[PDB]
């Protein structure tokens, strides 16, 4: 179906403890494939998925050069941002950037992204048009003016519609065993007495890829949104994800509750009940 490639970058200053630490990771869909950490003994971009390992030495050299240069511009940016916000040099601050592309089944660009946050807050984002900017505040407007003057957006658009989509197409082919395989959830319901009056029903989804999934409980056919505890989807560590949804059920009402599961690896959504 549809796919994404995204690069994430974080620099965190640490005054009095050397230069800001820079960490960048790349994903295709929910699969990590490259990483770079400036605190590594010998910082290089490193493979993290089998289908990227076949890239040759020129690829790794170029990628590493890009990551090193971005670490340095982030350090200049963190200095600039202290000026823009009138901040002292004493505290730790955070600069984050994400960029990348979403494509459809036919591989054409669906949406591109390039956006920054400072201290956990939206700072400036390339709009969906890939041609104009949304600045969160008057500091980010200073950046916007510089980026408009330098026609940054036009360069980003060229990458996002061109190289980004072409790399993603290559990776999807080289990784077709895994990137193009959905693993459906393994599902079951457990029952956990709380008191004489009620018990938890917990609906589990395990071993699924990609991470997107919908779990819901109904009672007599009515969604129980307010009364469902839904944990964040979480990594298992073997590429797959886990999730559960739980409801507190009065004694003897268990068969009125049904759990509903949607996942791209399922040809039809599932309905489950507690099976004593």
């Amino acid at each position: 179906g549809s796919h994404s490639m995204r690069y994430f970058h974080t620099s965190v200053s640490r005054p009095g403890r050397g230069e800001p630490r820079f960490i960048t990771v790349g994903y295709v869909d929910d699969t990590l494939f490259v990483r770079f950490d400036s605190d590594a003994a010998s910082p290089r971009e490193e493979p993290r998925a089998p289908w990227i390992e076949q890239e040759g030495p020129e690829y790794w050299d170029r990628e590493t050069q890009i990551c090193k240069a971005k670490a340095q511009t982030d350090r200049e940016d963190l200095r600039t941002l202290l000026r823009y916000y009138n901040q002292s040099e004493a505290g730790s601050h955070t600069l984050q950037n994400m960029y990348g592309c979403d494509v459809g089944p036919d591989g054409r660009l669906l949406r591109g992204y390039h956006q920054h946050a400072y201290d956990g807050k939206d700072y400036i984002a390339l709009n969906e048009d890939l041609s104009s900017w949304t600045a969160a505040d008057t500091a980010a407007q200073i950046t916007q003016r510089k980026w408009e003057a330098a026609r940054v957006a036009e360069q980003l658009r060229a990458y996002l519609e061109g190289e980004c989509v072409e790399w993603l197409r290559r990776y999807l082919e080289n990784g077709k065993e895994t990137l193009q395989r959905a693993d459906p959830p393994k599902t079951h319901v457990t029952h956990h007495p709380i008191s004489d009056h009620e018990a938890t029903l917990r609906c589990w989804a395990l071993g699924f890829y990609p991470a997107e999934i919908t779990l819901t409980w109904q009672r007599d056919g009515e969604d129980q949104t307010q009364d469902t505890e839904l944990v964040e989807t979480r990594p298992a560590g073997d590429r797959t994800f886990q999730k559960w949804a739980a409801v507190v059920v009065p004694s003897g009402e268990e068969q009125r509750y049904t759990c509903h599961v949607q996942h791209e690896g399922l040809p039809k959504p599932l309905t489950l009940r507690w099976e004593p």
């Binding site: 890009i66 600039t80 980026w147 940054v152």
Partner: peptide
């Protein structure tokens, strides 16, 4: 593969 376009705030 990454964007190679230096961009400073």
């Amino acid at each position: 593969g990454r964007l190679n376009q230096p961009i400073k705030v």
